[PDB]
Amino acid sequence: HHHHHSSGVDLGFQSPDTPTRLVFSALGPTSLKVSWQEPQCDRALLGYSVEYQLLNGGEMHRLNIPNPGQTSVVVEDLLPNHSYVFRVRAQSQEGWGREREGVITI
């Protein structure tokens, strides 16, 4: 099978760089804005993937962010006083850059 990006471009080397430190901003008691800086790449970025989970284990949630210009996402329904790990990496046509990890206690 041939997998394509959400934008339609075909997938499949100089990888994207790693994003800088993740910035977290609370929007209420259970909602969190996660922001980063677009990393450099010789090629066009297609977007980002954001994965997060409780540090102590739990279901891994994954979000695909299909705009290279979209460098933030708001996550909802988080558990107060629980610690999470977020990992963000940039995607190009040729593959994935390395992940930037950031952790936070809600």
Numbering used by the authors: 1438 to 1449, 1455 to 1548
Give me lines lifted from the publication on this model.
While α6β1 is expressed in the early stages of myelination and is crucial for the radial sorting of axons, α6β4 is predominant in the late stages and mature myelin. The two basal lamina receptors of mature myelin, α6β4 integrin and dystroglycan, known to be together responsible for myelin stability, are according to our results bound to the same scaffold protein, L-PRX, at the Schwann cell abaxonal plasma membrane. The third cytoplasmic fibronectin-type III (FNIII) domain of β4 integrin (β4-FNIII-3) was identified as a high-affinity binder, and the complex was characterized using biophysical and structural biology techniques. We have shown here with a collection of methods that L-PRX binds, through its C-terminal region, directly to β4-FNIII-3 with high affinity.
To aid in structural modeling and understanding the interactions in the complex, we solved the high-resolution crystal structure of the rat β4-FNIII-3 domain. The structure is similar to the human β4-FNIII-3 domain, consisting of a β sandwich made of seven β strands. In two of the four monomers in the asymmetric unit, the His tag could be partially seen in electron density, being in different conformations. The β4-FNIII-3 crystal structure was used to model the solution structure of the complex, which cannot be crystallized due to the flexible nature of PRX and the fact that the exact binding site remains unknown. The structure of β4-FNIII-3 can be used to predict the binding site for PRX. A surface analysis of the domain crystal structure indicates an elongated hydrophobic groove lined by β strands 4 and 5, which could accommodate a linear motif, possibly in a β conformation; this would extend the smaller β sheet from 3 to 4 β strands. MD simulations of the structure further show that this region is the most mobile segment of β4-FNIII-3, and the cavity can open even more. Furthermore, although the FNIII-3 and -4 domains of β4 integrin are rather homologous, sequence conservation in the possible binding site is very low—in line with the observation that FNIII-4 does not bind to PRX. Thermal stability of the proteins was studied using label-free differential scanning fluorimetry (nanoDSF), whereby the signal came from the folded β4-FNIII-3 domain. β4-FNIII-3 has the same melting point (+70°C) in the presence and absence of PRX-C, suggesting no large structural changes are induced by PRX-C binding. A dissociation constant of 1.7 ± 0.1 μM was obtained for the protein-protein complex using ITC, with a binding stoichiometry of ~1, being in good corroboration with the light scattering data above.
